[PDB]
């Protein structure tokens, strides 16, 4: 059940150099892991960059190079362009199959950081009549993409009961908007009082918490 | 000029069966390793398997060995992916890819949705305000296309309609929000779900205690 680990997110800017790493849970990455790097651009647009740790796929710009630094495989971009903002996936070969890592969201800074405006929406009475309760946390017009929404219910950390959705990057001001929906049955919703959304983002000094108490205004 | 043209896919119920095709042109298919890969919502790229030009070696990630089968017909420049006894977690965009040093050539992707749901219109719930934010929650519909407008199309700026999420129920849910200059007007989301012949207009106003 090998796991391939990459940085979740990294930030560079046009003209700079940045290196991404790829680590194996079984030990040091070696030649027979044949590290491959694949770039995912918006619209699920995939491009192979590097195969077998070092080799450029034909047509890939020379600013992409592979390496083995220490126990890890690495991708280096020398002179990053705006077009390089993407998710970079590393796959390692384990004798008879490839395993992709979780991917690195690479930001090539387009603009000043913009912190999200954070809004929480309790479930309507109308939804509660239907037997379910959805709590909606909105993150509006933020940049860059990386953001952490965490739900706390009576200060208990939630897990598995929320889903996230994000807009396209805005073509004019480069921002995103994100919804995080906490979905409970009405019964589970009414067992608790404090419903809190906690948001972490670069534009925020400290994480921001929007909350409400069930049954008040 | 090099084209990996995918076809097939679509909706299949849990336990069902589906075969995807990938027809290659612009290269001598019979000398290329081919691979299938997938991209599920909220999950990274996952490699499914690969197959040699002569089909004598077919490799799979072991966890998918029992639900995916790879084959090719070099005479018809076609790569195949058989999906077998599909599970709900197999909902994803599937891509064929050809090896040249790395993952060199890529198909346009095939959407496969695994859901046991029958068609069903959404419930529309207000997201009451309190720059002010408000919206509509469009919950538990099937299949995917809903259209959302605000005030019959008049209101467009500040509007964010989020991609639908497929829930573990096999139903879609979606939100649509607007920022407005803290006024009172009247705000109505118009939700149209053609497959269920659903048309709902929901007024969104502040909660009264």
């Amino acid at each position: 059940q090998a796991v391939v680990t990459q940085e979740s997110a990294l930030t560079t800017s046009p003209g700079e150099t940045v290196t991404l790493t790829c680590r194996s849970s079984t030990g040091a990455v070696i030649t027979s892991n044949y590290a491959n790097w694949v770039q995912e651009k918006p619209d699920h647009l995939f491009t192979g960059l590097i195969g077998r740790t070092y080799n450029r796929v034909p047509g890939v710009p020379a600013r992409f190079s592979g390496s083995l630094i220490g126990d890890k495989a690495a991708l280096t971009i020398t002179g990053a362009q705006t077009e390089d903002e993407a998710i970079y996936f590393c796959a390692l070969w384990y004798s008879n199959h490839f395993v992709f890592g979780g991917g690195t969201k690479l930001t090539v800074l387009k603009r000043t950081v913009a912190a999200p405006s954070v809004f929480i929406f309790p479930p309507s009475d109308e939804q509660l009549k239907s037997g379910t309760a959805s709590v909606v946390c909105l993150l509006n017009n933020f940049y860059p993409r990386e953001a952490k929404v965490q739900w706390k219910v009576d200060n208990a950390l939630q897990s598995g009961n929320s889903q996230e959705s994000v807009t396209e990057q805005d073509s004019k001001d480069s921002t995103y908007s994100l919804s995080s929906t906490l979905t409970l049955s009405k019964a589970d919703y009414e067992k608790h009082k404090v419903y809190a959304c906690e948001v972490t983002h670069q534009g925020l000094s400290s994480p921001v918490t929007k909350s409400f108490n069930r049954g008040e205004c | 000029e090099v084209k990996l043209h995918q076809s097939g896919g679509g909706l299949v119920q849990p336990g069902g069966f589906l075969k995807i095709s990938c027809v290659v042109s612009g290269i001598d298919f019979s000398r290329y390793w081919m691979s299938w890969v997938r991209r599920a919502p909220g999950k990274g790229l996952e490699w499914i398997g690969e197959i040699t030009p002569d089909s004598n070696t077919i490799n799979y990630v072991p966890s998918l060995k029992d639900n995916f089968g790879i084959s090719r017909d070099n005479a018809k420049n076609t790569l195949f992916l058989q999906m077998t006894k599909v599970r709900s977690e197999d909902t994803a965009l599937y891509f064929c890819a050809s090896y040249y040093e790395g993952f060199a050539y890529w198909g346009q992707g095939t959407l496969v949705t695994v859901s046991a749901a029958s068609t069903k219109g959404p419930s529309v719930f207000p997201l009451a305000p309190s720059t002010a934010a408000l919206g509509c929650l469009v919950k538990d519909y099937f299949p995917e296309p809903v259209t959302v407008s605000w005030n019959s199309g008049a209101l467009t700026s500040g509007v964010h309609t989020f991609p639908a999420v497929l829930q573990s129920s096999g139903l879609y849910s979606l939100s649509s929000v607007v920022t407005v200059p803290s006024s009172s007007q009247t705000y109505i989301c118009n939700v149209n779900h053609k497959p269920s012949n659903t048309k709902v207009d929901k007024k969104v106003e502040p909660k009264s205690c």
Partner: peptide, 7 residues
């Protein structure tokens, strides 16, 4: 044969 992504 086109070189594959692994050896």
């Amino acid at each position: 044969t086109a070189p594959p992504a692994h050896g």
